Amino acid sequence: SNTLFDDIFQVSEVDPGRYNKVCRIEAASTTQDQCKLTLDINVELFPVAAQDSLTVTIASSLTRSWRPPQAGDRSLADDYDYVMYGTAYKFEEVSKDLIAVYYSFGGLLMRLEGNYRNLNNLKQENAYLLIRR
């Protein structure tokens, strides 16, 4: 809107599978013992070590041709240190209650498992990923 999903995740693994700028992160939420996250992060501009505590936010707004940031007086939903824009591609249900959402950030893949995704994560070319601390 505003926000669509928010949580603080605990980093399980950090793997650079034959890459030097990218790492695939494995995580689970600190709150929900069922919620999981699998995400490719650009460790060159945002390094993530093992056992870290990162705030993952999924938004939908802060369309047409892209304009360079232009410091001027420009302000977006950024109070974070890592922002990404991508598209939703698969919404598979993993047993009765549990469901998973698939996002691609220009080929940087994201898989989020849980149940409370509900009236939020929809079939959109839109979706912004915001990570802080």
Interface positions with other proteins (CB under 8 A): 17-22, 24, 38, 40, 42, 44-47, 64-70, 72, 78, 80-87, 89-92, 102, 104-109, 111, 123, 125, 128
C-alpha–C-alpha distance, residues 26 and 12, integer Å: 5
Comparing CB distances to other proteins, the nearer of 31 and 50 is 50
Comparing CB distances to other proteins, the nearer of 22 and 28 is 22
Residue given tokens 């220009």 in the structure block? 106
Least distance between other proteins and beta carbon 100 (Å): 9
Least distance between other proteins and beta carbon 105 (Å): 5
Least distance between other proteins and beta carbon 30 (Å): 23
C-alpha–C-alpha distance, residues 133 and 49, integer Å: 12
Comparing CB distances to other proteins, the nearer of 29 and 127 is 127
Give break positions in the chain: residue before each, C–N beyond 2.5 Å.
Answer: 62
Which residues are paired to 114 by β-bridges?
Answer: 99
Comparing CB distances to other proteins, the nearer of 21 and 31 is 21
**85 is written with which tokens?**
């824009």
Residue 127 and residue 60 in contact, taking contact as beta carbons nearer than 8 Å: yes
